[PDB]
Each structure stands twice: as C-alpha cells, then as structure tokens.
Amino acid sequence: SLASWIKENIKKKECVRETPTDAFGDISFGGLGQKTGKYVRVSSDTSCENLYQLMTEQWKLRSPNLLISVTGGAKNFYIKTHLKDKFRRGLIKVAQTTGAWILTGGTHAGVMKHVGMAVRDYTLSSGSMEGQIVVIGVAPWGVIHNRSTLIHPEGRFPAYYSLDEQGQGRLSCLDINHTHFLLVDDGTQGHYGVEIELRARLEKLISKLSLGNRESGVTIPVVCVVLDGGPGTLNTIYNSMLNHTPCVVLEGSGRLADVIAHVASVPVSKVTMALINRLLKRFFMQEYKNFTELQIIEWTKKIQDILRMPHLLTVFRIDEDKNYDVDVAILQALLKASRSDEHAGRHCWERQLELAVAWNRVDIAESEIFTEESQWTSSDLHPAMFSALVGDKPEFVRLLLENGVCVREFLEREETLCELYSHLPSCFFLRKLAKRVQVCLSHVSEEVRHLLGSFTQPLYIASRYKPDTVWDPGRDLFLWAVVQNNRELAEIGWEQCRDCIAAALAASKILRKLAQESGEDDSEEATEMLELANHYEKQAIGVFSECHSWDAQRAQKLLIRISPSWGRSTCLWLALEAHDKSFIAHSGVQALLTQIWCGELSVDNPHWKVLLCMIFFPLIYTGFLTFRRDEDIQRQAERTEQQKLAMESELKPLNCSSRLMSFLKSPQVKFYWNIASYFGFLWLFAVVLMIDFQTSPSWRELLLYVWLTSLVCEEIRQLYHDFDGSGFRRKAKMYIKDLWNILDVLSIVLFIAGLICRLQASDTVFYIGKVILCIDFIIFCLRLMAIFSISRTLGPKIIIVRRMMLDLFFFMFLLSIWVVAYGVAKQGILIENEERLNWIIRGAVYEPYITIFGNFPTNIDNTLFDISSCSVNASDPLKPKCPMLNADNTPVFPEWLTIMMLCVYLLFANILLLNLLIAIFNYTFQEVQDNTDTIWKFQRYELIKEYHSRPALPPPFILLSHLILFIRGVFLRDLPQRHKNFRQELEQTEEEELLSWEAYMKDNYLASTRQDESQSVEHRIHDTAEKVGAMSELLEREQEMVSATEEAPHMFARQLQYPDSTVRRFPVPEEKVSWEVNFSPYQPPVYNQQALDKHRNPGGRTGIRGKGALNTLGPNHILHPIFTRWRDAEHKVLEFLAVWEDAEKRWALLGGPAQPDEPLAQVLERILGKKLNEKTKTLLKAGEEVYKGYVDDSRNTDNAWVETSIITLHCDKNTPLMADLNHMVESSLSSHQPLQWREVSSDACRCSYQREALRQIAHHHNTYF
Amino acid sequence: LASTRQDESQSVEHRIHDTAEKVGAMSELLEREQEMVSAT
Structure with a gap:
C-alpha cells in the first residue's frame, strides 16, 4: 500500500x-x-x-x-x-x-x-x-x-x-x-x-x-x-x-576521547598551543607524528574553546567506582545540561520533572528530584500527576502519591474530572459512551446507571459537583480506574476509598455486567474482566471476615447500612444482585439471615419446642422458648457485674402483654400457619370434589371459590410491594424465569377454565368441567413438593432428580423401537392378514409392551387354541385371529422357536438396557456432590424475603388484611416500615466512627496478606535466586579491583567565527593572548565591515583586524543607567525598570549607546523617550558609578572594542520621579514592547555584563545584615 | 517459541538447578581468591 x-x-x-x-x-x-x-x-x-x-x-x-x-x-x-x-x-x-x-x-x-x-x-x-x-x-x-x-x-x-x-x-x-x-x-x-x-x-x-x-x-x-x-x-x-x-558525553577508550578526557582535568586558561601539542603528541603517536602543523593552531584553540562551557560535558572517568552502567551517566548528564538554559526560575524544577514523566524510568528522576533538602507543595505537582494518570504509568503515580500529592486537593474542581474522562483508551465502555454521545458528566452517569441497575440513583449531577449526590474524591478515581480494565491503577485506587466493602462489590457487579454484555472481543472479556471481578470478590470477603472476627454486633450494622456514596443502595443488595455465590456463603451473613428469619424470638431454640408453643398459646407467656430481649438484658447485667467485680478486687426493658403480639409476626410462625392452611385447602378441595359435587353450588364450593381468589390476591400484592418496585415487568421477568412458577401459572388459569365449564350448565359440558378440575387437583398437590425444598436435608435431593429428567424420554424411545420391532415380527410370522386395525395395534404394540414387565414363567402364555377364533373373518367379541394351522390343533411354526425368540428378546430387554439407565444416575449422583453447598444458601435468601412482606393473618383471612392494606393505601398517606430491617439509614456520628473503624480494619488486612505472602516457599526461592545472581557478578568485579594492583583572557572575542559575516578570525591561544608575548606566524586577515595601526586592544590579541561594524576605531562606549526603586512599601524586595525586547524575549537593561563627549541628559532623553524631563531634572543628582571599563563581546577586534560605564540610581520607597516616567512607559522605542519595573535579585544567570552589576547591587544592599 | 522459553525458565524445578550451579561456582572461586591473598 x-x-x-x-x-x-x-x-x-x-x-x-x-x-x-x-x-x-x-x-x-x-x-x-x-x-x-x-x-x-x-x-x-x-x-x-x-x-x-x-x-x-x-x-x-x-x-x-x-x-x-x-x-x-x-x-x-x-x-x-x-x-x-x-x-x-x-x-x-x-x-x-x-x-x-x-x-x-x-x-x-x-x-x-x-x-x-x-x-x-x-x-x-x-x-x-x-x-x-x-x-x-x-x-x-x-x-x-x-x-x-x-x-x-x-x-x-x-x-x-x-x-x-x-x-x-x-x-x-x-x-x-x-x-x-x-x-x-x-x-x-x-x-x-x-x-x-x-x-x-x-x-x-x-x-x-x-x-x-x-x-x-x-x-x-x-x-x-x-x-x-x-x-x-x-x-x-x-x-x-x-x-x-x-x-x-565522552568515554575513556578512544584516541580523541582520551585527548578530551586528559584536557578535561587541566584548566581552560592553561591550554596553550605548545601545551596542547605536548598533550596530543602522546595520544595518537601515528598521527601525532603525522600532524599537519598548519591546522594545529585551530585544534588547540578549538579545544580551548570547547572546554569553556563546563556543564554540557561529562565523562565516564575510566569506570571510577561503579557508577552503574553508562545508562545513567548519560541520563543524568542530560538533566545536568538541562538545568542551565534560557529559563531563570521555578520553571527549572517544573520543566525538569516532565522529562522524568515522559520516560518510563523512575529511579534516576526520583533520586535527583526528591532529595531531602528540597521542599514541595501539593498544588505544584498536579500537571505531572495528570500526565502520569493519562499515560497509565503505575509506579510513578504511586511515587507521586507517597511524596505529597493529596487526592482531596487534586480533584477540587469539576473541570479536571471532565478532562480526565477525555482520555480513555479504547474499550467496550468507550464504545458504549460513543453510542451515548450520538464530555459533560451526565453522559457518564447515564451509562453507569444502566450498568449498575435501574434501582439506584444517578451518581453525578451537572454543575453541582461542589457540595443527593454527595462528593467523595475517592470513588471518582476508583471508578475511572475500574471501567477501563486496568489492574495496576485499580489496586492503587482501592486503597484510597473511604468505605471499602460497598466499593469492591460495586466494581464486581460493573465488571460482570460489562463482560456479559460485550461477547465479541472474546479474549479480553473472557479472561481479564472475569479474573478481575473474582479478585475484587475475594478482596471483599477478606475485609468482611476480618471485620467479623473482631466484634460482630457492629459488623452487622456495617453490612446493612445505606451507603450515600454509591447512590443510596445498600451493600447486601449489591452482592445479592451480582450473582456472587462466594460472598453470600460467608458465615456472618448466614447468621444474619438466620437471625432475621427467626424473628423476634431468639435463635438456637429447637423446633419441637417451637411447634409445641404454637400448639398452646399461653405457654409462650409462661415461658418455654427463650427471647432475645431478656437474653440481652441478662448479658448486659452480667457484663456490668463483671466490670464491677474487676473494679472491686441502651437496652430495652421487657414488655409483658405485647410479648404475644410480637411473637405472632415472625416468619417461622407464618410459614407454619401457611402450611397448615395449605393442608386445609387440600382437605376442603377433596371433600368438595368427591362428596359435595352437584349441578348447583353449595356453601362449601363458595368457600372454595373465595379461598382460591384469596391466594391469587396475596400473590399479586406480594408482586408490587417488593423492592425494585418502581417500574413494570422487571419482577415479572424475574418470576416467570424458573420452572416452579409454571405450575401456579398453569393452575390458576385451568381452575378458571373449570369454573366457566362448571357454571356453563349443559348436558355434556358439566362432565368435562368436572374432568378439568380433577386434573388441576393433581397440580395443586404437586406444588407442595417445592415447598418442602426449604429444609437443608431435602434441599439438594430434589435438584438431582431435576437434573436427569431429560435422558428418560430418549431412553424410552430407544426401548420402544425394539418392542415395536419384536411385536411386528411376532404377529407377522404366524398370523395371516387381519383386516382389523384395532387388533393389529393391540397385538402389535400393546401385547409386547405388556409382556416385558411380567414375570418370565408367567410370560410364557403360548398355545395354539385357547380363545382365538378364526373360521369367521374376526369373531367380533374380543377374539383375535387364530394362528395358522397345518395339522389340526397344531401350530405350523414350532413353539420352541417362539420360546427361544422370546428368551433372546427378554434377555436383551432386561439386563442390557435398564441397567445402563440405572448406571447413568449413580455416576452423576456421585459426581454432583461437591458444588451443592452454595446454591442452597442463595435460594435461602430467595425465600426469606417473601414471608417478611406477607400479612400476618392466615390465607383464609388474607382477603380482609388485603382489603385493610388497600384501605390504608387509599388514605393517601404512605410511610411504610417495609423492609425496616433491610434498609437502614444511620445518624451522622455513628456513620463517621463506623467508617473510620472499618478503614482501620482494612489497613490491618492488607498488611496481613503482605506478611502472609512473603512466607511462602514459591516466593522465597525466587528471592534467593536473585540474591545469588547479584552476589555472583559482584565477586567477579571485586576480583578485578584487586587485579588492578582567574579567567584572565577574554573569551567572547576569540570566537572562531566572526559575528554576522563569513570571514573567520585567526585562531588565538590563551598563552599568546596578551600583547606581552609575540606569536611568530601571527597574521590576522583584515576585513572591516562594509589607519588600522592607530590603537591596540587593551584586552589582548583577537585575530581580527579592521573596524568591525563600528563607526570609529578604538573604544566604543555605551552607558547603562539603571532606574531602580523598591518593589513594595514594606521594603521586602527591590525592582528596576528594565526592558524586555520583542525580538529576544529577554529581561535586558535600559541603556543605549553613549557617544564620546555626549551629554547625559540628552542621551537619557534619547534612550528613555523623555516626553517629560522634569522628573529626571529633579533626579539628575541620583546615584551612579556601578562599574566602568572593558567589556568582552563577540564584536571586538584588534583595533575596535567595546567599553562601558554602569550606573545605578535607586530611589527611595516612594520614588516621586517614577510616576511621570511610568505613565509615559509604553512601546516607545519599538524594540521592547513590555517595559516595567521587574523585581530585581542577585541573579548571576542573566545577561553577562548585567549579572555582575546586579551581583554588586545585591552585594551593596544585603551585606549589611 | 519465545513464549514457552519465558514460561519454562519460571518454574521451580529449573530455578533450583540454576541456584545450585551458581553456588557451586561461587564456592570454588572463593578458595582461589583466598589463595591469591595467601600469596602475599
């Protein structure tokens, strides 16, 4: 392409x-x-x-x-x-x-x-x-x-x-x-x-x-x-x-490298043509002999030139000590060069980090930038934090978080979180967010609401990110880490969350929904998200089991409460919805469910006593089963007495009358009354169906009618009063899914069909209407077996019967083929063509199907003539056709052939088929034993919640309580205590102390697993191997260790290229720089720009002859007056009205060319643009004489040079001559577009002439203290 | 092939055999080093 x-x-x-x-x-x-x-x-x-x-x-x-x-x-x-x-x-x-x-x-x-x-x-x-x-x-x-x-x-x-x-x-x-x-x-x-x-x-x-x-x-x-x-x-x-x-960077081994490494120990002024010649001679020793001597002056001068900058040069130093490899040395020399540059300020450290961010490497950067001496602030690390999060580098984020970035300071404004959602790498979440935008935060929250569930409330709200929808910084970072399937960010995020257990289970649900929706990217969703979800499940179980060992009576309150962070959903519901079989089987939650189902009366009381107390009502008021209220009162009094005895050497009181009315509301009671009413329904239906049936209705059949419709009404009211009640068809979709609901769904329909046929009042329909109702009685009896699934003993029994139902139909089909074959053969052999189709089917399918289950001596029922009649075509009254006969009363076919065939047939039928059918069930039963314990606990919750939301009266009177509930409902006042032991809302201080308690428990847990992971064998072998590998290399190096036994010249005028021209200056060493020594081949070219023996350069030789870009030969003067004043009225800092040029962007001084014999007032009016010279006229007697003399510069030649006179006029605190000059301070000279009184300092990292003047200015001012 | 070579050198039954060989080399060498100092 x-x-x-x-x-x-x-x-x-x-x-x-x-x-x-x-x-x-x-x-x-x-x-x-x-x-x-x-x-x-x-x-x-x-x-x-x-x-x-x-x-x-x-x-x-x-x-x-x-x-x-x-x-x-x-x-x-x-x-x-x-x-x-x-x-x-x-x-x-x-x-x-x-x-x-x-x-x-x-x-x-x-x-x-x-x-x-x-x-x-x-x-x-x-x-x-x-x-x-x-x-x-x-x-x-x-x-x-x-x-x-x-x-x-x-x-x-x-x-x-x-x-x-x-x-x-x-x-x-x-x-x-x-x-x-x-x-x-x-x-x-x-x-x-x-x-x-x-x-x-x-x-x-x-x-x-x-x-x-x-x-x-x-x-x-x-x-x-x-x-x-x-x-x-x-x-x-x-x-x-x-x-x-x-x-x-240079090393030691090479020839020219050894040249620079040897010169790098000697000073820059000590470099000479003869000295560099004496050095280079013992370096090459081929080329030192073969040296071209017409260029060696340039060589010596060029090495003297390049050793003038002492911070862009680093050398390995012949592997001194063991400064690791060459990797760092290069990497540190890059930073060491990087510090001294064009920028002066806070920016050095600021710029310096971002280089450490962009490299994945952390050690070098960390050590240098995080020295003990340096101070920090949690504001000034935010851009590095942001770049480290987006670039997904974990260990660097952990380093920045350990060293002083607080998560609470970092997400102070909504904009940062909005921007942080704008950099997701591609994932299934990103595709769903892209579908939803067809980024303000509400588009996030809608997708999160669809992932988590329709019941919970929206997490974020637009333009209310400041303080429903309360603000925690923790869940935002944790959620952002979770939804992109990134393990190393999420494990950092979880240690930051305020509350823990709710967060872990919420992440579990988000990932399992996101896995079961995607299904296209098979590898990612099939492996990583399910592994991560099971991992956070394991973390939640660990934290809860650590909390349960300490003091369980606060652990249950931790398990119940509403968490305001995650949308006012509780914690148990999240674990329940997400199909977490492993968390719900933990012992404390089972004890919670038992303590709930067990009702007001305290647990650990045997059922026999409970049923006998149900038999006689006043035995409860006498006291035969223990109660929670009195046990807790006795335990509290015992604890108080124990504390008093240790010193020596809140809880409600018990009601007397409402004892009983509180007993008659626990679900263990209502289950027994409902099962009693269910036997009562079976009794009543049998006695109406067998005895009391008539063509007209009786009172017994009317009682039947109303009691059935009472059952239907209680089922409907337990639909709409459940949790997740808002909305339609979700609970209907929950209910219709499973097999045992089909029976109620069939039976309630077929009963009504029977009532229509029963009331239709016809001759023949009344019979069929009785028929359908007699069929439905089977179904109403059949759904009692599912009610006896609750007990642990009978729980896993029924599922094994349910599992193997499918194979029986195919097996029966396989057997039926064989019996039809046998029957058609048997009737075809010894019987002629019979015209009676009913006799064909009855002697072909039925008689063999009845043969196989009879006993084998009973089965041989074979003679020629007992009951069959055939002279006629088919004696009609229940007589089959006779077998065909050769002799009189004799079968032409031998009877022992029939015997032998029947023996082979029943031999194949009994032992070979049904024992296989048996053999399937035993192996499956043995195999299925291991995984049963959990699913029953999940179903145990699935039951319990129903009966807690059922009216107390037995189902014959559930109609009256349903009417009372509706009459309470039409009252237009609704403040239910529905599930007032599931959803609990805490007070403020209890919640704060509780969350701090459980955070302390989490910080116990993580240290527990880290100490228990570093004690395993499979880690400690990997440690000893690494330490042996380090100790081996080092020994070799140790063996090898034993085995080995000022600024007097001007430096800006000796630039080898002249500025803004093509001519080259003569190469001039440091030893022959002055006019005292004489260079014999000294012959500088003469090139004035665009009487050259009039004057001599006072600095020394320059290799440049002529007037190089100057109006006259000799000294060119420029005076630099400095207009200074204070920065503040408190005299805390100093300031000077320096210029900042639009071409160079540098804070330069305000001084122009001072001509020879120039008046200072007119030159000041020219250099300053004096529209008002009276402020300078009163201030003509200010201070001056900072410095005066020769200035090194690139423009200097053998004839012309540049000299200067530094002047500094610092006013008082008020500076009354500065208002008029500051008002006329604009873009006047057209080179410095900003021009203001920038704050002065002791900056030696400024312009070269001005750095010494500012250093003398600070030496004047601050040395007094 | 690179996947199985990286997954074979992470098993325990190989890494014990590596550490034994490195210990055997480091032991002999120490004796010789002692002898080198031993010669003055």
Whole structure:
C-alpha cells in the first residue's frame, strides 16, 4: 500500500537533475530469519514534513522520546575488553526502556559494527516481545558494494541479501544487525561525505518534534556520543555545542576521547598551543607524528574553546567506582545540561520533572528530584500527576502519591474530572459512551446507571459537583480506574476509598455486567474482566471476615447500612444482585439471615419446642422458648457485674402483654400457619370434589371459590410491594424465569377454565368441567413438593432428580423401537392378514409392551387354541385371529422357536438396557456432590424475603388484611416500615466512627496478606535466586579491583567565527593572548565591515583586524543607567525598570549607546523617550558609578572594542520621579514592547555584563545584615 | 517459541538447578581468591 505513496512523492537524483525515486522494499538477511529491515532511498534535499511522516506514520514506528546520536571513527578501533561490555549493556539499557531512537552511519565499518554487536547480543536475550529497539541508519546509495541485489523501480519486497566485504575500496558494505535504513543520493557514486548536512538538519529539526503533544512546550533532548573519531569528528561536536541544545558525553577508550578526557582535568586558561601539542603528541603517536602543523593552531584553540562551557560535558572517568552502567551517566548528564538554559526560575524544577514523566524510568528522576533538602507543595505537582494518570504509568503515580500529592486537593474542581474522562483508551465502555454521545458528566452517569441497575440513583449531577449526590474524591478515581480494565491503577485506587466493602462489590457487579454484555472481543472479556471481578470478590470477603472476627454486633450494622456514596443502595443488595455465590456463603451473613428469619424470638431454640408453643398459646407467656430481649438484658447485667467485680478486687426493658403480639409476626410462625392452611385447602378441595359435587353450588364450593381468589390476591400484592418496585415487568421477568412458577401459572388459569365449564350448565359440558378440575387437583398437590425444598436435608435431593429428567424420554424411545420391532415380527410370522386395525395395534404394540414387565414363567402364555377364533373373518367379541394351522390343533411354526425368540428378546430387554439407565444416575449422583453447598444458601435468601412482606393473618383471612392494606393505601398517606430491617439509614456520628473503624480494619488486612505472602516457599526461592545472581557478578568485579594492583583572557572575542559575516578570525591561544608575548606566524586577515595601526586592544590579541561594524576605531562606549526603586512599601524586595525586547524575549537593561563627549541628559532623553524631563531634572543628582571599563563581546577586534560605564540610581520607597516616567512607559522605542519595573535579585544567570552589576547591587544592599 | 522459553525458565524445578550451579561456582572461586591473598 505504501508503494502508491512511495512512488508518487519521493524523488531521486541522477546525471544535477531530479527524477522519481526507486529502490524500495524490505531487506531480509540470510542468516537469522528474525529480521526484516526496510530500505528506502532519498535525495540530497527532501521535504522535511514528508521525511518525518515517512519516519513516523508510514513505517508504524512509534513516537520518538529521546534522540541519541553515536558518531565518530568510521574505520576501526580496539577496546580493552572490560569497558566494551559495560558500554554495550548500557547503550542498550537506555534505548530499550525509553523508546529512544539511536542513529548512526549504517555501514559495517567500525563504530556501527559495535552498535550492531550490541543489538545482536541483546536481541537473542530479550526475545523481542514488544517495543523493538528502533535503530535508524544513514548510508549513501552509491557506495554499497553489492548494489544490484535490490535495485528495481517496482522494487522486490521479500528481497534476500548476502554479506560480502572483499570488494572494499571506494565502495563500502552494509551492516548486519540494524533495523531501518535511510539512503541518501548525491549523484556521485565515488563520494563518501554526502550524508552530513541531512543528518545535522534532521536532528536539529526533530528536536522540536515534541511540541503541541502535551501541556507544556519543552523540547525533546538530543545527545551526541562519540567514542573515537577523526579530524572531522570535532566539528560536529562544536556545531552541536554551538547549537547549544545537546549535551555531549565522552568515554575513556578512544584516541580523541582520551585527548578530551586528559584536557578535561587541566584548566581552560592553561591550554596553550605548545601545551596542547605536548598533550596530543602522546595520544595518537601515528598521527601525532603525522600532524599537519598548519591546522594545529585551530585544534588547540578549538579545544580551548570547547572546554569553556563546563556543564554540557561529562565523562565516564575510566569506570571510577561503579557508577552503574553508562545508562545513567548519560541520563543524568542530560538533566545536568538541562538545568542551565534560557529559563531563570521555578520553571527549572517544573520543566525538569516532565522529562522524568515522559520516560518510563523512575529511579534516576526520583533520586535527583526528591532529595531531602528540597521542599514541595501539593498544588505544584498536579500537571505531572495528570500526565502520569493519562499515560497509565503505575509506579510513578504511586511515587507521586507517597511524596505529597493529596487526592482531596487534586480533584477540587469539576473541570479536571471532565478532562480526565477525555482520555480513555479504547474499550467496550468507550464504545458504549460513543453510542451515548450520538464530555459533560451526565453522559457518564447515564451509562453507569444502566450498568449498575435501574434501582439506584444517578451518581453525578451537572454543575453541582461542589457540595443527593454527595462528593467523595475517592470513588471518582476508583471508578475511572475500574471501567477501563486496568489492574495496576485499580489496586492503587482501592486503597484510597473511604468505605471499602460497598466499593469492591460495586466494581464486581460493573465488571460482570460489562463482560456479559460485550461477547465479541472474546479474549479480553473472557479472561481479564472475569479474573478481575473474582479478585475484587475475594478482596471483599477478606475485609468482611476480618471485620467479623473482631466484634460482630457492629459488623452487622456495617453490612446493612445505606451507603450515600454509591447512590443510596445498600451493600447486601449489591452482592445479592451480582450473582456472587462466594460472598453470600460467608458465615456472618448466614447468621444474619438466620437471625432475621427467626424473628423476634431468639435463635438456637429447637423446633419441637417451637411447634409445641404454637400448639398452646399461653405457654409462650409462661415461658418455654427463650427471647432475645431478656437474653440481652441478662448479658448486659452480667457484663456490668463483671466490670464491677474487676473494679472491686441502651437496652430495652421487657414488655409483658405485647410479648404475644410480637411473637405472632415472625416468619417461622407464618410459614407454619401457611402450611397448615395449605393442608386445609387440600382437605376442603377433596371433600368438595368427591362428596359435595352437584349441578348447583353449595356453601362449601363458595368457600372454595373465595379461598382460591384469596391466594391469587396475596400473590399479586406480594408482586408490587417488593423492592425494585418502581417500574413494570422487571419482577415479572424475574418470576416467570424458573420452572416452579409454571405450575401456579398453569393452575390458576385451568381452575378458571373449570369454573366457566362448571357454571356453563349443559348436558355434556358439566362432565368435562368436572374432568378439568380433577386434573388441576393433581397440580395443586404437586406444588407442595417445592415447598418442602426449604429444609437443608431435602434441599439438594430434589435438584438431582431435576437434573436427569431429560435422558428418560430418549431412553424410552430407544426401548420402544425394539418392542415395536419384536411385536411386528411376532404377529407377522404366524398370523395371516387381519383386516382389523384395532387388533393389529393391540397385538402389535400393546401385547409386547405388556409382556416385558411380567414375570418370565408367567410370560410364557403360548398355545395354539385357547380363545382365538378364526373360521369367521374376526369373531367380533374380543377374539383375535387364530394362528395358522397345518395339522389340526397344531401350530405350523414350532413353539420352541417362539420360546427361544422370546428368551433372546427378554434377555436383551432386561439386563442390557435398564441397567445402563440405572448406571447413568449413580455416576452423576456421585459426581454432583461437591458444588451443592452454595446454591442452597442463595435460594435461602430467595425465600426469606417473601414471608417478611406477607400479612400476618392466615390465607383464609388474607382477603380482609388485603382489603385493610388497600384501605390504608387509599388514605393517601404512605410511610411504610417495609423492609425496616433491610434498609437502614444511620445518624451522622455513628456513620463517621463506623467508617473510620472499618478503614482501620482494612489497613490491618492488607498488611496481613503482605506478611502472609512473603512466607511462602514459591516466593522465597525466587528471592534467593536473585540474591545469588547479584552476589555472583559482584565477586567477579571485586576480583578485578584487586587485579588492578582567574579567567584572565577574554573569551567572547576569540570566537572562531566572526559575528554576522563569513570571514573567520585567526585562531588565538590563551598563552599568546596578551600583547606581552609575540606569536611568530601571527597574521590576522583584515576585513572591516562594509589607519588600522592607530590603537591596540587593551584586552589582548583577537585575530581580527579592521573596524568591525563600528563607526570609529578604538573604544566604543555605551552607558547603562539603571532606574531602580523598591518593589513594595514594606521594603521586602527591590525592582528596576528594565526592558524586555520583542525580538529576544529577554529581561535586558535600559541603556543605549553613549557617544564620546555626549551629554547625559540628552542621551537619557534619547534612550528613555523623555516626553517629560522634569522628573529626571529633579533626579539628575541620583546615584551612579556601578562599574566602568572593558567589556568582552563577540564584536571586538584588534583595533575596535567595546567599553562601558554602569550606573545605578535607586530611589527611595516612594520614588516621586517614577510616576511621570511610568505613565509615559509604553512601546516607545519599538524594540521592547513590555517595559516595567521587574523585581530585581542577585541573579548571576542573566545577561553577562548585567549579572555582575546586579551581583554588586545585591552585594551593596544585603551585606549589611 | 519465545513464549514457552519465558514460561519454562519460571518454574521451580529449573530455578533450583540454576541456584545450585551458581553456588557451586561461587564456592570454588572463593578458595582461589583466598589463595591469591595467601600469596602475599
């Protein structure tokens, strides 16, 4: 697909004229079939945007994070084989982990061969799972030796290529372990240095690639490392340090590296042509002998030039100590370069972090930026927190949260949360949110409400995120972490939540709904979401079981309460709805359900006593079963007595009359009265059906009618008064789902059908109407067995019978085939064609089907003539046709054949079929035993809630209580205590103390599992292996350790390039800088811009002769008056009306050119734009004389130079001459568009002349204290 | 193939065999190191 673009956009060069390019395809090497490097060509100049697009969007290479540049050498060199291993290891450690791009001249010659051995020696050890080591390479297209192996205008995409390097010469080869190839063409096949400008321009361009991607405009870091190099190698390093963007790191091994590493110990003024000559002589010792002496002056001067900047240079120092690998050294030297730059301020630390964020690496950054000395503030880490959340890097978020970011300060405003929802990676939740937007927070909340359930209330409300819908910061971060299926963020989020158990179960329900809805992305939803949901289930069980061991009487209140965070739903309902079989089987919740179902009367009282108390009502008032109220009163009195006895050496009182009326409301009582009424219904229906039936209705049948309709009315009122009552058909969909409801649904219909037929009052219909009602009595008897499913003993018995129902029909079919076959054979053999179809079916299907169940001696009922009659076609009165006879009273067919056939038939029928049918059930029964315990507990809740919402009276009188409930309902007042022991709303202080208690219990739990995980064997072996692996390497290194036994010259006027021209100044060392010494070959070129022996430069030699951009020779003066005053009225800080130029954006001084013999008032009016010089006229006698003398600058020559006189006029606290000057302070001079009294300081990181003047100004003011 | 090589070097029955070999190398070497100091 790329071939359409790559043959339409990219040109080439030939003959210089241009043409559309060629040579495109992916080079694959014959050795290891694990590489496939792409090859593309390009011209000397190619569109920069197209180059970056081809590098970024085309070849699927991800975004660049760090650009590192290995350069130098190109021929060969040898490392003493100790530094090379550290070098190869570190240069891959850094690139691998920071998604870096490393570039090199890609040709198997010298330095790139070492990079290739690095990539090859690592690429087997990692396995290349993800994040490949992107290594980009630059090589000219003419100088490849075996060029014909891929040249084609339509390309050759799976091209094979073999290595050859015997054809060396002007031609060169191509390397082995790279991954990406860019090829440049200059048109001349016999050219080597055609790739320099494209490299330098591309790197300097690309440095600005990371702009507009994030919150702040900080440019990407670029580094150039050179191990060994020729003469040209220094020039790229100088052009880089002049570009002032990269750091440059050097090592010990190389020749030119040893040159710079030796000069880096000596001072910059101590560098001399003779001293550098004496140093370089004992460095190469081939080229030191073969030195070109017409350029060595430039060499000495250039090294003296590049050692002037002492903070963009770092060196390895011959592996001193063990400063780890080279990975950090580069990474720290990048930051050390990064601090001293154009920005002065808070921004150094501010900019500095964001680099640590963008790299996945945390250790270096953490140590440097989080030193003990430094102070912080929880406001100033917010942008780094935000970028660390969106980029989904967990450990860095944990580090920022441990060190002083409070979650409560971070989500103070709604806008931050709105923006944080705008960066989800793609998931099923994101697709559903995209469907809903066809982002304000309400669109989130509607989708969350649909996920969680229709019953709960909406979480967020628009423009009320400040303090229903109360604000906790915790659930917002936890929910945002949960819905994108990210484990390492969610495990941090759960430790932040105020309340815990409700949150964990809510996340469980969200994930199981999101899994059972999606179903298309099979791997993700099938594995990750279900594993995560079971994990948060396990966390919830652990926290609750830790709370239950401490003191259970607050644990139940924790289990009941309404949680206002999650939408005023309780906690038990969430676990109940989400099909969490494991949480609901925990012992404390079962004890809660037993204590509820057990009613007012206290638990642990045996059923025999309970039923006998139901038999005689006053035995309760006498006291035969214990009660909760008196047991608690006795226990409280016993606890009080125990406390009094330990010192020595609230609870309601009990009612007397309402004892009984409180007894008659517990569900254990109503279940027994309802089952008594159910036997009563069976009795009444039998006695009406068998005895009391008539053509006219009796009073018994009317009692039957009303009692049936009372059952129907109580079922309907227990529909609409349940929880989740708002809305329609949800409880209907809940109810119709299962098998046992079908029976009631059939029976209530068929009963009414029977009543219609019964009242229809016809001759023949009345019979069928009695028939249907006699059928329905079977169903009304059949649904009692489901009522006897409640008990634990009979609970799992019925499900095993329910499970194996299906196989019996297919088995019966298989047997019926065999019996029909036997019957048709038997009747066909010894009987002629019979015209009677009823006799055919009765002797063909029935008689064999009746044969198989009789006893085998009884079954042989075989003689010729007992009851069959056949002289006639078919004696009608129940006589089958006779068997056909040969002799008189003799079967032509032998009777023993019938015997033998019947023996084989019943032998196959009995032992071979039904024992298989039996054998199915025993194996299944043995197999099904393990998983039963839970489902029964879930059904145990499914029962209990019904009877707690049923009127107390038995079902014969449930009509009157239903009428009383409706008459209460039409009263228009509704404040029910319906489920007043399920939904509980707490007071304020009880809730606060309770949540703090359970948070303390959670913080106990997590420490418990961390101490119990680090005691297992399967962890501790993995620890000992790592410690042995560290101790082994170290010993080798230890063995190896034993095995090894001011600013006097001007520095701005000696720029090797003159400013704003093409001429080059003469190279001037530091020793021969002054006029005292004499240089013998000293011959500077004379180039005035656009009598040169009139004056001499007082600083020294400059290598520049003439008047270089100056109106006169010699001293050029410029006075710099400083208009200063106080910042505040309290004299806390100082300030000066400095300029800030629109071209340079720098806080520069306000001083123009002072001419020789210039009046200060007129020059002040020119430099300040005095529309009112009376304020300066009263202030002509202010202070002056800060500094005066020679100023180093790039413009200085041997004839002209620049001198200056610094003046500082600081007024009083009021500064009465500053109002008129501040009113006329505008964009007057048209270069400084802002111009105000910026606050002064002791800043030595300012303009070079002004830094010393401000340092003297602070030395004047603040040294008094 | 990379998946099974990374999942084979995480089992216990391999990693014990690795630690035994590294302990056996570190023991011999210490004796030789003692001898090196032992020669003055």
